[PDB]
Design a protein around this ligand. Structure first.
Ligand code: K
Ligand code: MG
Ligand code: MG
Ligand code: MG
Ligand code: MG
Ligand code: MG
Ligand code: MG
Ligand code: MG
Ligand code: MG
Ligand code: MG
Ligand code: MG
Ligand code: MG
Ligand code: MG
Ligand code: MG
Ligand code: MG
Ligand code: MG
Ligand code: MG
Ligand code: MG
Ligand code: MG
Ligand code: MG
Ligand code: MG
Ligand code: MG
Ligand code: MG
Ligand code: MG
Ligand code: MG
Ligand code: MG
Ligand code: MG
Ligand code: MG
Ligand code: MG
Ligand code: MG
Ligand code: MG
Ligand code: MG
Ligand code: MG
Ligand code: MG
Ligand code: MG
Ligand code: MG
Ligand code: MG
Ligand code: MG
Ligand code: MG
Ligand code: MG
Ligand code: MG
Ligand code: MG
Ligand code: MG
Ligand code: MG
Ligand code: MG
Ligand code: MG
Ligand code: MG
Ligand code: MG
Ligand code: MG
Ligand code: MG
Ligand code: MG
Ligand code: MG
Ligand code: MG
Ligand code: MG
Ligand code: MG
Ligand code: MG
Ligand code: MG
Ligand code: MG
Ligand code: MG
Ligand code: MG
Ligand code: MG
Ligand code: MG
Ligand code: MG
Ligand code: MG
Ligand code: MG
Ligand code: MG
Ligand code: MG
Ligand code: MG
Ligand code: MG
Ligand code: MG
Ligand code: MG
Ligand code: MG
Ligand code: MG
Ligand code: MG
Ligand code: MG
Ligand code: MG
Ligand code: MG
Ligand code: MG
Ligand code: MG
Ligand code: MG
Ligand code: MG
Ligand code: MG
Ligand code: MG
Ligand code: MG
Ligand code: MG
Ligand code: MG
Ligand code: MG
Ligand code: MG
Ligand code: MG
Ligand code: MG
Ligand code: MG
Ligand code: MG
Ligand code: MG
Ligand code: MG
Ligand code: MG
Ligand code: MG
Ligand code: MG
Ligand code: MG
Ligand code: MG
Ligand code: MG
Ligand code: MG
Ligand code: MG
Ligand code: MG
Ligand code: MG
Ligand code: MG
Ligand code: MG
Ligand code: MG
Ligand code: MG
Ligand code: MG
Ligand code: MG
Ligand code: MG
Ligand code: MG
Ligand code: MG
Ligand code: MG
Ligand code: MG
Ligand code: MG
Ligand code: MG
Ligand code: MG
Ligand code: MG
Ligand code: MG
Ligand code: MG
Ligand code: MG
Ligand code: MG
Ligand code: MG
Ligand code: MG
Ligand code: MG
Ligand code: MG
Ligand code: MG
Ligand code: MG
Ligand code: MG
Ligand code: MG
Ligand code: MG
Ligand code: MG
Ligand code: MG
Ligand code: MG
Ligand code: MG
Ligand code: MG
Ligand code: MG
Ligand code: MG
Ligand code: MG
Ligand code: MG
Ligand code: MG
Ligand code: MG
Ligand code: MG
Ligand code: MG
Ligand code: MG
Ligand code: MG
Ligand code: MG
Ligand code: MG
Ligand code: MG
Ligand code: MG
Ligand code: MG
Ligand code: MG
Ligand code: MG
Ligand code: MG
Ligand code: MG
Ligand code: MG
Ligand code: MG
Ligand code: MG
Ligand code: MG
Ligand code: MG
Ligand code: MG
Ligand code: MG
Ligand code: MG
Ligand code: MG
Ligand code: MG
Ligand code: MG
Ligand code: MG
Ligand code: MG
Ligand code: MG
Ligand code: MG
Ligand code: MG
Ligand code: MG
Ligand code: MG
Ligand code: MG
Ligand code: MG
Ligand code: MG
Ligand code: MG
Ligand code: MG
Ligand code: MG
Ligand code: MG
Ligand code: MG
Ligand code: MG
Ligand code: MG
Ligand code: MG
Ligand code: MG
Ligand code: MG
Ligand code: MG
Ligand code: MG
Ligand code: MG
Ligand code: MG
Ligand code: MG
Ligand code: MG
Ligand code: MG
Ligand code: MG
Ligand code: MG
Ligand code: MG
Ligand code: MG
Ligand code: MG
Ligand code: MG
Ligand code: MG
Ligand code: MG
Ligand code: MG
Ligand code: MG
Ligand code: MG
Ligand code: MG
Ligand code: MG
Ligand code: MG
Ligand code: MG
Ligand code: MG
Ligand code: MG
Ligand code: MG
Ligand code: MG
Ligand code: MG
Ligand code: MG
Ligand code: MG
Ligand code: MG
Ligand code: MG
Ligand code: MG
Ligand code: MG
Ligand code: MG
Ligand code: MG
Ligand code: MG
Ligand code: MG
Ligand code: MG
Ligand code: MG
Ligand code: MG
Ligand code: MG
Ligand code: MG
Ligand code: MG
Ligand code: MG
Ligand code: MG
Ligand code: MG
Ligand code: MG
Ligand code: MG
Ligand code: MG
Ligand code: MG
Ligand code: MG
Ligand code: MG
Ligand code: MG
Ligand code: MG
Ligand code: MG
Ligand code: MG
Ligand code: MG
Ligand code: MG
Ligand code: MG
Ligand code: MG
Ligand code: MG
Ligand code: MG
Ligand code: MG
Ligand code: MG
Ligand code: MG
Ligand code: MG
Ligand code: MG
Ligand code: MG
Ligand code: MG
Ligand code: MG
Ligand code: MG
Ligand code: MG
Ligand code: MG
Ligand code: MG
Ligand code: MG
Ligand code: MG
Ligand code: MG
Ligand code: MG
Lengths: 48, 275
RNA sequence: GAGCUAGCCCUGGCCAGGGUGAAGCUGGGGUGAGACCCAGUGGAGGCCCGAACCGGUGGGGGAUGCAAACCCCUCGGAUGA
RNA sequence: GAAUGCCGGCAUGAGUAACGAUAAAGAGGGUGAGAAUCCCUCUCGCCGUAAGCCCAAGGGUUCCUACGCAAUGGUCGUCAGCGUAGGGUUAGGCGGGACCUAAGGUGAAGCCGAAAGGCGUAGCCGAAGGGCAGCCGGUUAAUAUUCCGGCCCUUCCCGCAGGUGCGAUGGGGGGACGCUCUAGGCUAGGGGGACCGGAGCCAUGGACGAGCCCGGCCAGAAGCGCAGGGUGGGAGGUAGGCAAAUCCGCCUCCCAACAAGCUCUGCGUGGUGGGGAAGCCCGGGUGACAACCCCCCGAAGCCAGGGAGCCAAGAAAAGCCUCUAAGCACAACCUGCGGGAACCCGUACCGCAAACCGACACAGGUGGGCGGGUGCAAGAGCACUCAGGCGCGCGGGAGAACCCUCGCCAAGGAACUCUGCAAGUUGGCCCCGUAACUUCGGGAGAAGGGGUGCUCCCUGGGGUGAUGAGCCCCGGGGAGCCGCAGUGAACAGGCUCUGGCGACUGUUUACCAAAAACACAGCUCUCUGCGAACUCGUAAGAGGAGGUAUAGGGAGCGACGCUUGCCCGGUGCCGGAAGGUCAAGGGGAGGGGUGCAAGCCCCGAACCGAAGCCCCGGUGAACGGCGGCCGUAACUAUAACGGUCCUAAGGUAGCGAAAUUCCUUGUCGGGUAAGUUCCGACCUGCACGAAAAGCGUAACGACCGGAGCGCUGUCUCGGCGAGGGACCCGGUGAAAUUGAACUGGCCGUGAAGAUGCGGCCUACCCGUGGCAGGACGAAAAGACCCCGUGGAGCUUUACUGCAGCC
RNA sequence: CGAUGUCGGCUCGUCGCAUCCUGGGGCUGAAGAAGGUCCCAAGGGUUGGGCUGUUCGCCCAUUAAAGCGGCACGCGAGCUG
RNA sequence: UGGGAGAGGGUGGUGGAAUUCCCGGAGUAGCGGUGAAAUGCGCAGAUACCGGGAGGAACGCCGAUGGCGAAGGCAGCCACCUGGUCCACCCGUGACGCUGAGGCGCGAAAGCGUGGGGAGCAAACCGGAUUAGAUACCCGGGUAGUCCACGCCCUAAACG
RNA sequence: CCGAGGGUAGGGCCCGUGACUGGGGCGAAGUCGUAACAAGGUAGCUGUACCGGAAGGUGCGGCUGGAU
């Protein structure tokens, strides 16, 4: 049946992308946190 | 004069439709319509703040002229009478001798081809708009401003009418369509006659889907829900109210008055409605 | 976190074919005039049968499955909420 | 050494289950160390509204070629979506951007919030909507509307010519719109040809034929033809379109009007440029100077912004045209022509799937377009087939039980069973015919029946064409022929009678409930006079609603019919300018502390003092509630009648052993041979009863009862047959479980149900197919029950707060 | 209670005997036939249906008879639900 | 052809008296009701009195033993639309008549449906009293209805 | 071919009968009240509506076949 992951590049970039994170205080804390951990990727990769 | 159907479906058995006999023009005046933003009953937060709204027919909003003291003294011709899905009344298209075109709600008895006018000097004729102080006592009027220059507020629904009861100083006593006796200011405008389309009340929607067309989504009885949802929720099997009948939010709903106690307009209500 | 699901908003798209035959209109009759009757025309409907499509009624299978809800038979809706 | 411990390693089950749709395979020839599995050929089978083709999303090199086979591939592998390497994606016109707006988002102004932030007009962003210029063929191993060829077009810059009051983010027009139905004329697409072109064929009894087989086009500028769409001309006045305006709007006059004209599309033709089969021969070559014509069918597509009807009344903005404003009229615009200029991103490949979403090369899920022929009434249904694509990545045997899916069955025919569960029966079309009841629509496909193929003969009407022939489409009548059977295969209702519930079509517990539940039109009550009530928010601000009592909120009831009685003492709500209580505050009789004192400082009575409560009324489609005991009639029995106690008032009409009745399978009646169910009645209603509605009701229901007819493998009662497994052989090879095990029966005993203790009996060692009685078999630290001064949801006249409101 | 699945049916039986039938008896208020009551006896037998979930019971039609009990109210790693 | 009387009908208007309610004023201990009372109402200011407003219904005197209509029935006043009828003149037609099964229409009150309206009255209902009882008569309340529009119902001591 | 009639299916009319149920007629001396005839002690009758153990009451409109 229809499953839960229905990939969509515009949805992905508009929800989790870099600019979405920076627009709000929680998203900037995400980026600060993920930088501090040393994540190679701050944000989901989406081929756009 | 409402129209019936034969019982050739279970719903056609009872469905009644307006006769649309007064309509003379079946498309709106392009320069006078603008897109009506649908809400679904959601507010700027995105929250349902009025339950059970949405999914009705698309409509364009026709700009109605609730002032008319814009154009004091300039007569107009009644060019057409049209359908307006944003209100119960029909609307009337007016070609002014000015050359400007406007919409008013169509009073009962208005005929295409007649001419109307607005101002202190106007004939006491169906369709004319005067400051309330110049209308003789006992005249049936509609589209009444509640305050001067602020716009026609009262008696706009199909078949409604307020009647002038008498004068007191700068103020006139109107009997509103509810039966309240209010003092409206004399400089407030109003239009002679009652609103048209009186048979509007006699329409039988006939079936559920009709209400769906009008944007009315199904309405759930509190008695049908659970305690998390509504004072009347829960109970094993059916259940009486089991407490004073209440809204989803707790307050009582059989008799409890809710007009604000100290409202400054109280100095101007003479008698609350009856019936 | 509403890329699942629930509702609403904007903008598009889809619904083989067949059946029933409302109003109206036309003619005929009727009558003081009417109501009304008859025929034809007409093509209404949360109308009827049935694919697509949306479903999931009963039974059987499946049960370390093909599948963390599937398969077969059968069944509901199918211009409409 | 134990923690259902943690991490790892390795065992057991076991050479066991399985190897993923039952669409299906066989042989020959290649290659190679090695072949059921790769390549080629022939034969066979499967899909064909797809299992074929083209887009979009998502995927991201998977594409093509060479060389490879350790791992991946459920087997094998020489093969591969796998490993290594090289190659491959070409645009002014296709899509998106340098254009426009939609919801929404953002947001100069402005507003609000302890901070973070929340709003917000314009504006800006935002597409699969609007707008905008490319068709056909050829070419590569791999791209092509992109390269090439032919024929077309767009915008920008500049120049020349002609023309004009030129000029905009401003005004206006237009853009610009629904649902159903639908005309005319085309096109796409298709059928036929005794006409045109073609390599060839004559078989096995016949055919050298008006024979068989194949093919008979595509694109195209301007003109022209056909069919459509859009569109009045002129003048005078003008105060409106937030300046102006010759535009638009409004008014008057003249003319024109189903037209025409003008303009814009579609289709046809059109210089021209392409293509071109079967068969044969080795993707090609030949066919071939290929031929390219006639008739019919014909769209849901095109003309298109077409037409009619209906109510639920159907985006915006830019391009574009027009009007003027500053300005400027050496300019500028418009038209024609010429030269020049024309950027960025995508383009491979998969794409109903082995490449996307499902941990898998997973029987699941995934939006758009094309989707051929014949026959069956039609169709995208069904069967078979074209193009095209596949035989589903383990095979070979055997022909037990048993399982699954399927076929048939003597006599009986529901006797099966909780239940006809299941499976039969019926089944399309045409014709005849069709009941109670009814809201007059219906019930209705009621029920029940007859017809159905093929051949000959005669004949009626329609479309095209021409009025005819031909082709096509509906029929009618007569005579015959064959079979068990003519919707001969496939697809395609079993029916009736009678109850309960719900009016109805709808909706629901994604993944155990589809219902009588929810919803529903309709009825009532109540609130709300608009800066409404109500809702969300600290607020600003929103929704309500660009609505205004024929409207909006809340509540219950639930189409429709006939109806909905009595109780206001308690709770709620509504009304009540008296009274009673009533907090802060006012007041200050009178006290107190301290100081020598002026003073400073504390306590404080009467009295005034709101809402709330008390009190007085109203109010039931507000919360709710609607009696007991005793007696009495000329047979008896029973009480119309009476007595008395109590209540705020004592259940009305209509229903009643009921979706309610405990005693109960009540009693009587019906139906059966027999009826705890069913239907109809009676009424001592444990414990109906009137909008938590009462009693009915045509129609409707995958709802739940009862009966009958039909017909059956459900059954008496089983039998045989088919395929896929199970079994055997080659290949690959799991699992939960497991203290160790050298693991028998009885009668006893034992923590009370012993392979393990006692006594006796029985028993050579090890397997394979089977069956499930035991191993208190496995799985899940019982979900029932209790316990914990453990937790959570929910309630209220439990406690105490808070919002909100007064 | 770190689980001993719980009514009834179906299927499959097996045991007890306090015997329903069939075999053998004594007593009889046993004339015969038929029966009553008790003793011995477990070899075999012990039907089909209507009603209800039922066990049980009632009822219809038969019968030699239409027995009563145990086996975790025998039997859900055998089915049903 | 000329005239006449009339609550004949339909539509639209509109006048005053009265009752009730509401507001203001003035005012105080009762009012009301009956056979007698009680319920009820009233110091929370009633009744009685004056001014103001809202609304519905019915039209006093004229009024008659009257008039009109086929019957049911029709009564302030005004206008419009419309039926019948009588008299005069003796002008026109030339028996064109009477009745009338069926048919059709009209048809008081009550009653019914959908809207409205609602002052007074008042089935049902509640209370007070009377009474053996009193589901009545009498009293205080009181919902349909009475009124309007449309559509039904079609009855009668629809009687002379 | 027609055809008595047999069969299957569905209708219409009549007759008999049926748990139970509705009122009706009648029946020497039952129970409850007193509605009508006198102004019958609320004049009566009336069509209709609602109500009540029962006769009846009440409303609305009508008739005198109403007394004084
Ligand atoms: K329990
Ligand atoms: Mg889903
Ligand atoms: Mg999605
Ligand atoms: Mg996307
Ligand atoms: Mg997208
Ligand atoms: Mg998205
Ligand atoms: Mg983003
Ligand atoms: Mg976001
Ligand atoms: Mg921050
Ligand atoms: Mg990582
Ligand atoms: Mg790095
Ligand atoms: Mg992130
Ligand atoms: Mg009808
Ligand atoms: Mg109208
Ligand atoms: Mg506009
Ligand atoms: Mg809005
Ligand atoms: Mg916003
Ligand atoms: Mg937001
Ligand atoms: Mg709401
Ligand atoms: Mg809503
Ligand atoms: Mg409205
Ligand atoms: Mg309207
Ligand atoms: Mg005012
Ligand atoms: Mg209307
Ligand atoms: Mg309404
Ligand atoms: Mg609507
Ligand atoms: Mg609604
Ligand atoms: Mg509801
Ligand atoms: Mg409701
Ligand atoms: Mg509930
Ligand atoms: Mg519930
Ligand atoms: Mg919640
Ligand atoms: Mg609650
Ligand atoms: Mg409750
Ligand atoms: Mg409940
Ligand atoms: Mg209950
Ligand atoms: Mg419930
Ligand atoms: Mg309760
Ligand atoms: Mg409450
Ligand atoms: Mg509130
Ligand atoms: Mg009011
Ligand atoms: Mg979603
Ligand atoms: Mg459809
Ligand atoms: Mg269809
Ligand atoms: Mg027809
Ligand atoms: Mg028509
Ligand atoms: Mg037709
Ligand atoms: Mg139908
Ligand atoms: Mg339908
Ligand atoms: Mg049909
Ligand atoms: Mg589904
Ligand atoms: Mg299923
Ligand atoms: Mg079945
Ligand atoms: Mg499962
Ligand atoms: Mg399936
Ligand atoms: Mg199927
Ligand atoms: Mg259907
Ligand atoms: Mg539609
Ligand atoms: Mg230890
Ligand atoms: Mg361990
Ligand atoms: Mg473990
Ligand atoms: Mg542990
Ligand atoms: Mg571990
Ligand atoms: Mg390990
Ligand atoms: Mg290691
Ligand atoms: Mg290991
Ligand atoms: Mg092993
Ligand atoms: Mg084994
Ligand atoms: Mg396995
Ligand atoms: Mg498997
Ligand atoms: Mg299959
Ligand atoms: Mg197949
Ligand atoms: Mg072979
Ligand atoms: Mg082979
Ligand atoms: Mg090799
Ligand atoms: Mg091989
Ligand atoms: Mg090999
Ligand atoms: Mg193979
Ligand atoms: Mg090959
Ligand atoms: Mg061969
Ligand atoms: Mg096909
Ligand atoms: Mg390998
Ligand atoms: Mg290898
Ligand atoms: Mg290998
Ligand atoms: Mg290697
Ligand atoms: Mg492998
Ligand atoms: Mg695999
Ligand atoms: Mg490539
Ligand atoms: Mg190009
Ligand atoms: Mg540029
Ligand atoms: Mg933009
Ligand atoms: Mg804050
Ligand atoms: Mg954006
Ligand atoms: Mg954009
Ligand atoms: Mg776009
Ligand atoms: Mg383009
Ligand atoms: Mg082109
Ligand atoms: Mg090359
Ligand atoms: Mg438009
Ligand atoms: Mg528009
Ligand atoms: Mg659009
Ligand atoms: Mg519509
Ligand atoms: Mg063409
Ligand atoms: Mg064809
Ligand atoms: Mg003109
Ligand atoms: Mg001007
Ligand atoms: Mg076009
Ligand atoms: Mg050649
Ligand atoms: Mg289409
Ligand atoms: Mg369609
Ligand atoms: Mg079009
Ligand atoms: Mg806009
Ligand atoms: Mg110059
Ligand atoms: Mg020009
Ligand atoms: Mg650029
Ligand atoms: Mg490409
Ligand atoms: Mg592809
Ligand atoms: Mg699929
Ligand atoms: Mg597709
Ligand atoms: Mg693939
Ligand atoms: Mg596979
Ligand atoms: Mg798959
Ligand atoms: Mg097609
Ligand atoms: Mg073909
Ligand atoms: Mg067919
Ligand atoms: Mg296969
Ligand atoms: Mg396979
Ligand atoms: Mg397949
Ligand atoms: Mg074997
Ligand atoms: Mg199969
Ligand atoms: Mg067969
Ligand atoms: Mg045979
Ligand atoms: Mg048989
Ligand atoms: Mg039978
Ligand atoms: Mg039979
Ligand atoms: Mg049976
Ligand atoms: Mg049954
Ligand atoms: Mg069942
Ligand atoms: Mg069958
Ligand atoms: Mg069939
Ligand atoms: Mg019948
Ligand atoms: Mg019938
Ligand atoms: Mg019936
Ligand atoms: Mg009928
Ligand atoms: Mg028929
Ligand atoms: Mg039939
Ligand atoms: Mg025949
Ligand atoms: Mg034949
Ligand atoms: Mg034969
Ligand atoms: Mg069928
Ligand atoms: Mg029937
Ligand atoms: Mg239901
Ligand atoms: Mg239903
Ligand atoms: Mg019901
Ligand atoms: Mg009903
Ligand atoms: Mg319903
Ligand atoms: Mg439906
Ligand atoms: Mg479920
Ligand atoms: Mg569930
Ligand atoms: Mg679940
Ligand atoms: Mg299920
Ligand atoms: Mg259902
Ligand atoms: Mg529900
Ligand atoms: Mg409901
Ligand atoms: Mg109702
Ligand atoms: Mg809130
Ligand atoms: Mg708040
Ligand atoms: Mg708004
Ligand atoms: Mg509401
Ligand atoms: Mg309900
Ligand atoms: Mg009470
Ligand atoms: Mg009270
Ligand atoms: Mg109370
Ligand atoms: Mg209480
Ligand atoms: Mg107070
Ligand atoms: Mg109580
Ligand atoms: Mg009653
Ligand atoms: Mg009973
Ligand atoms: Mg019942
Ligand atoms: Mg029940
Ligand atoms: Mg009960
Ligand atoms: Mg019982
Ligand atoms: Mg019982
Ligand atoms: Mg019984
Ligand atoms: Mg019987
Ligand atoms: Mg019964
Ligand atoms: Mg009894
Ligand atoms: Mg209730
Ligand atoms: Mg209840
Ligand atoms: Mg109730
Ligand atoms: Mg009825
Ligand atoms: Mg019913
Ligand atoms: Mg019914
Ligand atoms: Mg249903
Ligand atoms: Mg159902
Ligand atoms: Mg049956
Ligand atoms: Mg069998
Ligand atoms: Mg076999
Ligand atoms: Mg062997
Ligand atoms: Mg092996
Ligand atoms: Mg392997
Ligand atoms: Mg050991
Ligand atoms: Mg050992
Ligand atoms: Mg052993
Ligand atoms: Mg042993
Ligand atoms: Mg023991
Ligand atoms: Mg033992
Ligand atoms: Mg042993
Ligand atoms: Mg031992
Ligand atoms: Mg020992
Ligand atoms: Mg031993
Ligand atoms: Mg032994
Ligand atoms: Mg073996
Ligand atoms: Mg074995
Ligand atoms: Mg075992
Ligand atoms: Mg077992
Ligand atoms: Mg065991
Ligand atoms: Mg154990
Ligand atoms: Mg065990
Ligand atoms: Mg066991
Ligand atoms: Mg488990
Ligand atoms: Mg634990
Ligand atoms: Mg435990
Ligand atoms: Mg547990
Ligand atoms: Mg316990
Ligand atoms: Mg304890
Ligand atoms: Mg405690
Ligand atoms: Mg404790
Ligand atoms: Mg606790
Ligand atoms: Mg808690
Ligand atoms: Mg707080
Ligand atoms: Mg336990
Ligand atoms: Mg364990
Ligand atoms: Mg366990
Ligand atoms: Mg247990
Ligand atoms: Mg059995
Ligand atoms: Mg004897
Ligand atoms: Mg024996
Ligand atoms: Mg039994
Ligand atoms: Mg038992
Ligand atoms: Mg029993
Ligand atoms: Mg015997
Ligand atoms: Mg036993
Ligand atoms: Mg046990
Ligand atoms: Mg026991
Ligand atoms: Mg027991
Ligand atoms: Mg089981
Ligand atoms: Mg069992
Ligand atoms: Mg077990
Ligand atoms: Mg069950
Ligand atoms: Mg007093
Ligand atoms: Mg005083
Ligand atoms: Mg009033
Ligand atoms: Mg004469
Ligand atoms: Mg009448
Ligand atoms: Mg009394
Ligand atoms: Mg007395
Ligand atoms: Mg008289
Ligand atoms: Mg015979
Ligand atoms: Mg006596
Ligand atoms: Mg007597
Ligand atoms: Mg008397
Ligand atoms: Mg008396
Ligand atoms: Mg009675
Ligand atoms: Mg009375």
């Amino acid at each position: 049946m229809k499953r839960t992951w229905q990939p969509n590049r515009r949805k992905r970039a508009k929800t989790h992308g870099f600019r979405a994170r920076m627009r709000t205080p929680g998203g900037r804390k995400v980026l600060k946190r993920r930088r501090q951990k040393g994540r190679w990727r701050l944000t989901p990769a989406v081929r756009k | 004069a409402v129209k019936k159907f034969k019982p050739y479906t279970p719903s056609r058995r009872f469905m009644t439709v307006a006769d649309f006999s007064e309509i003379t023009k079946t498309e709106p005046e392009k320069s006078l319509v603008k897109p009506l933003k649908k809400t679904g009953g959601r507010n700027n937060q995105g929250r349902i703040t009025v339950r059970f709204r949405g999914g009705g027919h698309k409509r364009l909003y026709r700009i109605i002229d609730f002032k008319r003291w814009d154009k004091v003294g300039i007569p107009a011709k009644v060019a057409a009478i049209e359908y307006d899905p944003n209100r119960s009344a029909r609307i009337a298209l007016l070609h002014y001798v000015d050359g400007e075109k406007r919409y008013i709600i169509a009073p009962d008895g208005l005929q295409v081809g007649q001419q109307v006018v607005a101002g202190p000097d106007a004939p006491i004729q169906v369709g004319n708009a005067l400051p309330l102080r110049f209308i003789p006592v006992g005249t049936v009027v509609h589209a009444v401003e509640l305050e001067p220059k602020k716009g026609a507020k009262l008696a706009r629904a199909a078949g409604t009418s307020a009647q002038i009861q008498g004068r007191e100083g700068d103020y006139v006593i109107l009997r509103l369509p509810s039966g309240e006796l209010r003092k409206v200011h004399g400089e407030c405008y109003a239009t002679v006659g009652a609103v048209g389309n009186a048979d509007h009340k006699n329409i039988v929607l006939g079936k559920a889907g009709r209400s769906r067309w009008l944007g009315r989504r199904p309405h759930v009885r509190g008695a049908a829900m659970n305690p998390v949802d509504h004072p009347h929720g829960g109970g094993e099997g059916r259940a009486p109210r089991g407490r004073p009948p209440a809204s989803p939010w707790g307050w009582q709903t059989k008799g409890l008055k809710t007009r604000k106690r100290r409202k400054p307009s109280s100095r101007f209500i003479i008698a609350r409605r009856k019936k």
